[PDB]
Amino acid sequence: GSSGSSGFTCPITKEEMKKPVKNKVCGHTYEEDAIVRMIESRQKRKKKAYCPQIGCSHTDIRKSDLIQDEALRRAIENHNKKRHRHSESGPSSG
Ligand SMILES: [Zn+2]
């Protein structure tokens, strides 16, 4: 599986990811708010959470099989540290 050499985009929200969550069933990775808003948006519509990753065949995802991937977490931070978007925040308490 390969999408981008440098960067992480959620196939659902279609935006940068900050909290990558890996599944125990399949293994793919998605955004927290994404996998959280999806499962809640599906159930309410009498639906099921399926691998949103365009290309997968699986269609069985459970909130219980959702974990916080560290290997990916520290990775994303490695790019964010670069600081090339805002670079203008002087908070009194950090
Ligand atoms: Zn998958």
Side-chain angles (χ1 to χ4, degrees):
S2 18
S3 322
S5 63
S6 235
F8 284 110
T9 17
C10 195
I12 303 165
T13 63
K14 311 300 246 64
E15 63 152 315
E16 207 140 86
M17 303 209 298
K18 306 281 178 258
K19 276 131 180 135
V21 290
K22 195 209 70 173
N23 223 39
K24 315 233 67 160
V25 188
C26 173
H28 268 138
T29 3
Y30 321 109
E31 169 148 34
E32 200 171 272
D33 315 336
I35 190 61
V36 172
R37 78 180 291 279
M38 173 243 262
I39 302 165
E40 285 244 59
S41 166
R42 305 250 194 283
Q43 247 229 63
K44 68 112 84 137
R45 282 265 241 174
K46 299 123 188 263
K47 253 195 244 266
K48 75 223 76 196
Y50 45 88
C51 257
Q53 215 62 59
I54 308 118
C56 210
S57 254
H58 199 57
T59 44
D60 233 39
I61 302 175
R62 306 169 96 168
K63 204 192 291 154
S64 188
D65 273 61
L66 290 177
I67 49 172
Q68 309 183 330
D69 203 28
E70 234 164 286
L72 214 60
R73 260 240 298 280
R74 277 151 163 288
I76 302 167
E77 265 242 50
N78 228 233
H79 174 64
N80 305 131
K81 71 98 200 259
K82 200 270 146 106
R83 273 278 211 71
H84 220 227
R85 206 92 184 178
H86 263 70
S87 211
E88 203 67 25
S89 254
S92 269
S93 223

